[PDB]
Write a protein that binds this ligand. Structure first.
Ligand SMILES: [N-]=[N+]=Nc1ccc(NCCc2cncc(CCN3C[C@H](O)[C@@H](O)[C@H](O)[C@H]3CO)n2)c([N+](=O)[O-])c1
Length: 765
């Protein structure tokens, strides 16, 4: 029965628009298979299309905005693109039609509407680019009846082991096609849909822009050789129309020129299913996917006061759809230093210098290949898997579709090496590497990242204890299936738990340190003078100088999150001998949090170092870090320590801004300093943790119930309204929010954990 739900999930999720790095394209969850990409650009001149053409996601003054209005990876959805440079409002509707033995069929409608400022006679070039990777696989453009190109549909017929037989149709579409009266039209035709079928070695098929431009440049060279010159030049749009040469190959370029508004369909028909997919099929399946998305949202994301209104429902749909619509499939080699150089052990003073020397050996090599199926923080700036971001992404996604969330968790845990290491940053293949400076690619096996994926596993278990609709909950509705997943995953959770304990161990025994436990103490590896990249709070102030004797209260608190999850899961599995050791590790963390990290002087938890005089010193920087034992749910609701943290959180002079909790206190000496990344701005992921914990204390018998209730109510409001106002004004989710002004700053299209705001509005944690 596990195998069945497994095979059904596989078949449901195989196809998607799983290329979030580009405006619009498709691929299945298969490393070497059939992929598609959309390109468009106005052409006003002989030189402008190279600069106007769109393919990979960016955000600049030329683009107003873009994203998913509606999305479910099982059904498809609708994306809006507002392109100022090209004068176009584009719609890409994508739909899946289940059937056959191969992951089903799918269809897309591309619609371009010139905006008010565009010339009513603008010529827009549109390209649908189709590649197929594989040794024993074929794809062929059925040639046209016409001499120079296509009056109607373009039929591609192909086959692979993975997809069996399929056909891919690009329809005639609707819109005016310009006609050239030039002598060239006797040889190129007056203007029509064209296809070039090419082959390149499989590993470069992703470089669709250079592949296209090489063909455009060969056309222009041909014009020059055959005496088409500046005395009598063809119009720009004919100069940039490829000579029709359909055939077989692993690349198929389908090119259309439109004058004014346009639309055209892409129909993917799996032979192994019923009848082929039609345009009338696409139109209906789209209408129905909208109805279903509407119905699921109103149940799953029931927005509570004061966010019940339609304005906030639109907001919620946009923030959610962009989050789950960012889901990608990633395949290829990753860059890794497997030297395990001894300098990476960071056991002497000045360890950052030694670590730099080891990195300068440049022993890192390509390894894999790996696949990953994950949501992403940002399509334009960093469209790839980030380990602790994914824990946040999956909290809303899990509500929507717990079986999808568990699929993504599983994909992340299949990356884990023999030691219990997952790389914090997953850059799989040359396409992914294209977006990342060479200096920032190398993953380090000694680099951790917060294990936020356990928070998701926690929600799963809580839900476990208490056809597309069916598949989405299959793993909570069929408890036998739920436990089998946990049984298969548990060992790797344990492996990661031990890996933290072997690789991110702090040192008690070697210093004048007393504590309830000689074991429980942690220090993030990878830290430099200014940074602790691995903690996730890049420039949050830490002990200066960095020191082998440091202890990180956030890191211990994450180990605390991990043990509590292992207790829950281990028990659901009856692994008694493990639960005992976990029950005892937790007990030791609860104590050592107080003995090593609690400041009675300051009224908050702090990190620790050892002095110039070699004694344990608390290093207190009031901010996110200070709150961690609370944010991670480790303290008793009656704890006096919780009492003092609630005071700090609610204190306007420290953390409390009209716009949410400041990453760092206004009273801290480092407030607003340096890159000021985690040194003041409001981050939605940490505010989300605060809101959830406040609500927990707020709905419990205890002394702080009423304070917790006030701070919840107000913080929920401040966080939602800040993200809303900025979305209303800019159309973007932002990476962080200015505490002085409330303005969105840093990375746009951050969906991204800023999308947690849909869960903050829906309440009932
Ligand atoms: N200090 N530092 N200075 C700055 C750092 C970044 C800045 N802007 C975005 C640049 C950028 C590009 N590629 C990847 C990433 C990682 C983003 N992010 C980092 C989170 O901290 C981490 O927790 C989190 O996992 C990851 C992923 O969401 N970021 C700026 N800026 O725009 O001025 C100053």
């Amino acid at each position: 029965l596990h195998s069945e739900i497994g095979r059904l999930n596989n078949q449901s999720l195989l196809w998607g628009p799983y290329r979030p790095n580009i405006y619009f394209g498709t691929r299945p969850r298969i490393g070497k298979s059939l992929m598609t990409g959309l390109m468009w650009g106005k052409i006003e001149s002989y030189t402008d299309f190279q600069h106007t053409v769109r393919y990979t996601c960016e955000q600049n003054e030329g683009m107003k905005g873009y994203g998913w209005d509606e999305y479910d990876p099982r059904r498809g959805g609708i994306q809006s693109i507002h392109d100022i440079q090209n004068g176009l409002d584009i719609t890409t509707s994508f739909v899946k039609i289940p059937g056959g033995a191969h992951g089903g069929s799918w269809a897309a409608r591309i619609k371009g509407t010139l905006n008010d400022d565009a010339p009513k006679d603008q010529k827009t070039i549109v390209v649908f680019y189709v590649s197929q990777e594989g040794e024993n696989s074929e794809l062929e453009a059925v040639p046209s009846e016409n001499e120079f190109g296509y009056e109607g549909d373009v039929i591609l017929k192909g086959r692979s082991e993975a997809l069996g037989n399929y056909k891919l149709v690009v329809t005639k579409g609707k819109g005016v096609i310009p006609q050239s009266d030039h002598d060239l039209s006797r040889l190129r035709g007056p203007g029509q849909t064209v296809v070039q079928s090419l082959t390149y070695p499989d590993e470069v098929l992703w470089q669709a822009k250079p592949i296209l431009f090489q063909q455009l440049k060969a056309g222009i060279d041909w014009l020059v050789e055959n005496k088409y010159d500046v005395a009598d030049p063809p119009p720009p749009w004919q100069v940039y129309l490829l000579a029709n040469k359909p055939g077989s190959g692993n690349v198929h370029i389908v090119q259309k020129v439109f004058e004014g508004d346009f639309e055209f369909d892409i129909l993917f028909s799996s032979e192994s299913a019923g009848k082929e997919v039609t345009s009338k099929d696409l139109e209906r399946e789209v209408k129905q996917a909208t109805e279903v998305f509407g119905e699921r949202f109103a149940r799953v994301f029931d927005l509570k006061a004061p966010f019940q209104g339609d304005n906030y429902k639109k907001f919620g749909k946009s923030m959610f759809s962009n989050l789950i619509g960012g889901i990608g499939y990633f395949y290829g080699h990753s860059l890794v230093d497997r030297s395990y150089a001894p300098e990476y052990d960071e056991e002497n003073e000045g360890f950052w210098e030694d670590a730099a020397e080891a990195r300068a050996r440049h022993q890192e090599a390509l390894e894999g290949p790996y696949e990953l199926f994950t949501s992403i923080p940002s399509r334009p700036f960093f469209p790839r898997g980030f380990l602790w971001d994914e824990g946040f992404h999956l909290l809303p996604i899990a509500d929507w579709d717990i079986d999808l969330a568990l699929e993504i968790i599983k994909s992340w845990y299949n990356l884990m090496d023999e030691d219990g290491w997952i790389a914090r940053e997953q850059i799989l293949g040359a396409e992914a590497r294209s977006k990342v400076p060479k200096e920032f690619q190398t993953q380090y096996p000694h680099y951790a990242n917060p294990p936020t994926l356990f928070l998701v596993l926690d929600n799963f278990v809580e839900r476990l204890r208490k056809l597309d609709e069916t598949l989405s909950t299959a793993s909570v509705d069929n408890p036998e299936v739920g436990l089998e997943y946990l049984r298969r995953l548990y060992p790797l959770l344990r492996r990661q738990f031990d890996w933290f304990r072997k690789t991110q161990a702090g040192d008690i025994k070697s210093y004048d340190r007393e504590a309830y436990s000689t074991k429980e103490a942690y220090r993030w590896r990878g830290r430099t003078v200014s940074h602790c990249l691995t903690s996730g709070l890049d420039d949050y102030p830490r002990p200066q100088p960095p020191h082998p004797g440091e202890l990180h209260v956030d890191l211990m608190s994450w180990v605390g999150v991990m043990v509590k999850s292992l207790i829950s899961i281990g028990s659901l599995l009856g692994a008694t001998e493990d639960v005992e050791f976990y029950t005892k590790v937790l007990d030791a963390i609860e104590h050592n949090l107080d003995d090593l990290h609690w400041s009675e002087k300051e009224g908050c938890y702090c990190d620790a170092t050892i002095d110039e005089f070699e004694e344990h010193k608390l290093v207190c920087h009031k901010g996110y870090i200070s709150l961690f034992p609370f944010l991670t749910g480790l303290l008793k609701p009656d704890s006096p320590k919780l009492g003092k943290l609630l005071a700090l959180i609610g204190d306007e002079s420290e953390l409390w801004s009209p716009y949410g909790l400041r990453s760092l206190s206004k009273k801290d000496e480092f407030y607003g300093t340096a890159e000021n990344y985690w040194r003041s701005p409001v981050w939605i992921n940490i505010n989300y943790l605060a809101i959830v914990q406040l609500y927990n204390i707020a709905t419990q018998d205890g002394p702080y119930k009423e304070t917790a209730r006030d701070l919840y109510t107000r913080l929920r409001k401040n966080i939602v309204e800040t993200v809303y106002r900025n979305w209303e004004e800019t159309g973007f989710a932002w990476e962080q929010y200015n505490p002085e002004t409330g303005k969105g700053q840093r990375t746009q299209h951050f969906t991204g954990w800023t999308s947690l705001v849909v869960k903050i509005m829906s309440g009932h944690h």
